[PDB]
Write an enzyme that holds these catalytic residues in place. Structure first.
Site, PDB file in Angstrom:
ATOM      1  N   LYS C 133     -49.618 -58.525  -1.591  1.00 38.71           N
ATOM      2  CA  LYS C 133     -48.506 -58.393  -2.531  1.00 38.71           C
ATOM      3  C   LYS C 133     -48.603 -59.178  -3.878  1.00 38.71           C
ATOM      4  O   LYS C 133     -48.355 -58.865  -4.888  1.00 38.71           O
ATOM      5  CB  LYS C 133     -47.183 -58.575  -1.843  1.00 38.71           C
ATOM      6  N   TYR C 258     -50.514 -47.313  -0.704  1.00 42.50           N
ATOM      7  CA  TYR C 258     -49.679 -48.648  -0.238  1.00 42.50           C
ATOM      8  C   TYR C 258     -50.037 -48.882   1.210  1.00 42.50           C
ATOM      9  O   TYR C 258     -50.484 -50.200   1.119  1.00 42.50           O
ATOM     10  CB  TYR C 258     -48.116 -48.218  -0.246  1.00 42.50           C
TER      11      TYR C 258
END
Ligand SMILES: O=C(Cc1ccccc1)Nc1nnc(CCSCCc2nnc(NC(=O)Cc3ccccc3)s2)s1
Ligand SMILES: O=C(Cc1ccccc1)Nc1nnc(CCSCCc2nnc(NC(=O)Cc3ccccc3)s2)s1
Lengths: 397, 395, 388, 383
Positions: C133, C258
């Protein structure tokens, strides 16, 4: 008129007429029967015949003719009480719950005190349990004063200052809503703002007198009192109410020219107002009869006020349990820390049950269990049907 | 029983027909089937026995009407008031029509109609009351009543709650218990949807519901719109989000196709009705599970009772609270502009006007719903003895 | 220049005295900045001794870096004593057998000058998960800018619940360090292309960040997320209703890219350089290559500080004062600005979702050394300062 | 040494070259050296220069060798002055307007001041870190944080008084600063408590300006309905240490908000937080590093009201704003600061100071997560 009533019963012994009169549910002490009872006791100074019956009973022949022609909301009252007493016993076998002890005076009460009192919209009465014992209304007072404030000031003025909604569970620990107003008159922050709106000019003691007599009329002149004992302890422990009064003051939730500390003093005083189960049951019936006091026939509250009160007792009356109470009981009620539940069955009866031990939510354990059993037997739910109630029972017929 | 009815009026057939419509009834009323069929054979006058022959199979409902024993005896006056309310709301051009899909965006902003149906089958209608429109969100109580009727209150509420979330919250999909707040919201009706006819499939599940909905309407117009179904299905991403958050938190019954339930959900929303067929549907809920015009038990009084309780508290979106305070009547709003209003032990209504307000409710409709309560004592907490300056149509 | 260094280390130098002396500095012979020196040295072994002339012939190319090494001008000069402490802290964590795997334990160190240490299971591969992230947020900023990126994302921590919300009040996700915001920042990278070129491009960036040390992919953990993504698909569909994605975005495809990015593999060693790139202003310590911009590096470390250790962030920032990111596989991406970067990997997690052996190690490290964000460098009481 | 500095003398030439360092002759560490130049009066050879600077040669050398944290100070102040005049032209905002001043004190005692830095203003909310650093130093971290939390809040979670642990959220919210005020000097009375806090605020400022305004004290006593509301909810929840008179704690609380400082003394105050508990102009140990570290942490995430998130992002400096218009700026291991201008914004922060805190870091690599090696075009005043 008096004549048919006579034949309906040679001549007639007094006890024969009084026993039948009591069966209807009426009490001889009824203010609407005073003349009938005075003449009845005067004639015993001088068993009776036809024209004598016509002399004693004509004074209020209307009420007596309708009572003996079964024109009351519950015709068979003697079976209704048998069912009431049945439910009273069922609820009695529940010794759970905790008596509130946060002030010394509420902790005084025994956990075994269990009382339920009924008063109908046509005057009939029934009682069982510890009904002649006084307790403080506490939060049961909230509807009573909001009904008063709306009476004098109309539904629009009062709701410039207070809301008409149940907040939920979270958000309900919040003093105000998005618009800087309490969510409803049935929470502490709301009751205080409501309490400020009454008799704005005069001083505290007069306001108390003004309200104290309002409750006298709603109860048909039965017992209303004041416990300075509880008042003192409530007044010296409500740190959380002082937090509210200061936020209300800071956010300008009061009428201009209000003394905030003066209102909180008045607030505590009203919560320390006393009733019995029977004295309060007549109040609940005054809410059940559109503003008219059943046992006196006088007019105390406006229909606009009575309606709004039941509307708010429906949604935000029984604390956070209101959602499951409005779902399964479907009756407007109010809960108090002393263990009182002020219930109203519209167009039928008024009611007040009482037991000091409270649950996690703060409601009378024996009272909640009873209120639930009242609807499981009778078609009294707000959205029950008068034609098709299946396996239920309709005491109105 | 019949001879007296005959004495109370030889007789011109139409003067009997006038007096029947003078009760608020339609000659089309299925409970008058024998009379109308037996009448239609004999054909311009009647005697004692010819009348006797024609009214004997409907003598109860026919005596009940002429003897002024319906919930609303004087019914002609009642409709003069309903029409006066109607014309007043008809003057409120405010609001915006739902444009998010063309089907809802097509409809004229000036369409407006209201129909009533009492618990005794008495009928009135004014406005555009025969135009088909989707229930959209006026279906939520119907299938919840269907669900409770088949499964019971206990099973149904292992999955959905009984309370109004509040104001915010209700932005949240689920409450603190990983259950939808109540079945009157999208997250709630979806879980409720996945309870009905668990065993079979979508074609059968949709057939079963339409049967039940046919029953609630006395077989009046109940249809379906594929144009609305496709669009809604396409543009319902928020409902997909709910379905995936429901599956994540295990809110569905064992072995459920949450995608298959969504299509069932979208189908259930696109069911078409008119103001008339919906007026009976609400009247069934006003009659404890009995469709007034037919007389058949459709739902249990248990499911009817809970359904009314939830429309009262959770039914009008964010305006639900001010609705219960002022109107005091159970209702449901759909995006189409329809309000499924119920007056228990009295009547049921459907008011329809396409333009909605900020809350998402019909503007002429809520206007009408307020005016109805200012004029007559139908508010839930009004008193039947001292109602002051209002009107009591029950007499 | 080289003549000075020559007898910094008698007339001749054994070829193995030089390598053993530079190992003490913390550098490895594998260092990309020492290639020529080590190459020429092996060629010389073909013709074990070094004189003033061929020593100069070998170390002339990398003399500068070799001097700083032997001038003890590196950020942690006495490094051997520091790694001695790093091990003592390691064994402490090991003794704690608490945690719930969603036994192995290793911690690797890479300073801003390229010094190395690794103890435990530092060569065993694992899934990055949420530790990626910060990496893709920096890539976004490096390619787009902070004003574009935060036109879709926010820079705020949320709160205990509100954490249970997908969007903030502005119909934006709260911060790039939560699933909702990472999905949006994933929809920002390489827009016109497809997942094949998108993945390969992001993988290209991660390789430079780690100095071309191990960066890989897992398909097993990929197929797992594909099935368990009910919550990420709920977030994705609510993201569409509010139109949070850039136009022309297929979020069913963004959701697949993702899960790919969460499935990327590293070791504690390659990750240590990846985080040391963040500690060194965007330059990789072992290659000296510019990978990211200060704008990307600064922004990233900030959100790692306030939003990096899940909810534990506030608690973390008060007792640790270090920017970090945690993963469900059990690895934490630790960064000490101007000093070093790290990776601590132990799979079992605590109640809050953090690796028990990592949070323990981070607390002990700060307890011992004044690496805290607001620890002072002049008076640090009883703590250690490995800067000397 | 003294001889070294000698070649490295007319009096006016020694004192002028000293002033270039950012040091001032008023410096408490340079007193004795300045007492000696007072005696020689009524030109310095070796012997006489060695007699004057004899005492404090170690500090003076550090000055004349550019050993100080900022070596080229006058170049750094020329930028401070530029940033001052640039921030000066922004006139928006509302005051709880013509006054605006910024003051700098480094961790080496270097001074620079420009603007209205002589005018006394009330600390108000800026006293919350000071208040809290005292208590943690005096009580500890574990004790203090049993009564108050150490976490940020959220936009509307700060509408709440307490968290789910029934503690205030942090020492930077009014609910939290009310509790901290009840943690200091519990044994004594409100008069001795105040005097104690006052003495602490004097060491931090190196015996510079600290005061009290009764005018604002009374003005807080009249309006404190919200603080009264909070104080009464804290009492219902049993949050205070036992034996606490709560309505007097509030009185004390109001007194601390009405304490006067100037931009210059407050600059030394923030510098005591930037120097690890040591006062730069006196070299005395005032607060323990534990109290200083904890304080700068909570000045980062809770310091600037709701604006902390964008402040910790864009600025990356521990600060604390107040309603009078003051921002306590702290640059770790570099300087301490105070900006002051009455008009505030909708967040309640000084428009000129906010303008100044953004521009400062935009120019200088003072951001917490800037790199000391690679920082693009930003400035490094340390080299
Ligand atoms: O920004 C806004 C709203 C807003 C806010 C402010 C202004 C405008 C708009 N963004 C969102 N709007 N709708 C969203 C979807 C719902 S949240 C994600 C799915 C859920 N996760 N947890 C849920 N509930 C509980 O877990 C039970 C619980 C809840 C609360 C407490 C205890 C227990 S539901 S996100
Ligand atoms: O910890 C907990 C609660 C908790 C939390 C989690 C779990 C357990 C317990 N601590 C507290 N519990 N009760 C407290 C007092 C209430 S806050 C001070 C008085 C108010 N200030 N603003 C109010 N309303 C609005 O300002 C309207 C608004 C609201 C929201 C947005 C816009 C506008 S009321 S603090």
């Amino acid at each position: 008129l008096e004549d048919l009533l006579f034949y309906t019963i040679e001549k007639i012994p007094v006890h024969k007429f009084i026993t039948a009169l009591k069966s209807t549910g009426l009490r001889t002490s009824d203010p609407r029967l005073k003349e009938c009872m005075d003449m009845l006791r005067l004639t015993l100074q001088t068993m009776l015949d036809k024209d004598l019956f016509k002399k004693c009973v004509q004074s209020n022949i209307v009420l007596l003719t309708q009572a003996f022609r079964r024109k009351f909301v519950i015709p068979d009252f003697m079976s209704f009480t048998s069912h009431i007493d049945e439910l009273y016993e069922s609820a009695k076998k529940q010794s759970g719950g905790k008596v509130a002890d946060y002030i010394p005076q509420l902790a005084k009460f025994s956990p075994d005190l269990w009382g339920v009192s009924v008063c109908t919209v046509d005057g009939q009465r029934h009682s069982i349990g510890d009904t002649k014992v006084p307790f403080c209304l506490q939060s049961c007072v909230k509807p009573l004063k909001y009904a008063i404030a709306v009476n004098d000031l109309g539904t629009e003025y009062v709701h410039r200052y207070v809301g008409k909604e149940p907040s939920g569970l979270r958000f309900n620990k919040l003093f105000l809503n998005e618009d800087d107003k309490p969510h409803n008159p049935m929470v502490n922050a709301g009751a205080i703002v409501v309490t400020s709106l009454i008799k704005q000019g005069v001083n505290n003691a007069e306001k108390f007198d003004y309200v104290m007599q309002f409750l006298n009329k709603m109860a048909g002149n039965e017992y209303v009192g004041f416990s300075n004992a509880t008042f003192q302890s409530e007044r010296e422990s409500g740190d959380r109410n002082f937090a509210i009064g200061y936020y209300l003051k800071e956010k300008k939730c009061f009428p201009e020219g209000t003394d905030m500390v003066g209102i909180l003093d008045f607030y505590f005083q009203l919560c320390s107002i006393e009733v019995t189960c029977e004295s309060a049951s007549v109040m609940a019936a005054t809410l059940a009869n559109g503003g008219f006091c059943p046992i006196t026939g006088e007019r105390v509250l406006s229909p606009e006020a009575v309606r709004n009160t039941l509307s708010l007792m429906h949604s935000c009356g029984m604390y956070d349990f209101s959602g499951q109470f409005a779902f399964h009981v479907g009756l407007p009620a109010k809960s108090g820390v002393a263990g009182g539940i002020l219930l109203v069955v519209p167009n039928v009866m008024g009611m007040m049950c009482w037991s000091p031990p409270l649950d996690k939510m703060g409601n009378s354990v024996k009272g909640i269990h009873f209120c639930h059993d009242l609807v499981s037997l009778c078609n009294f739910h707000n959205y029950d049907n008068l034609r098709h109630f299946a396996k239920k029972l309709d005491p109105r017929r």
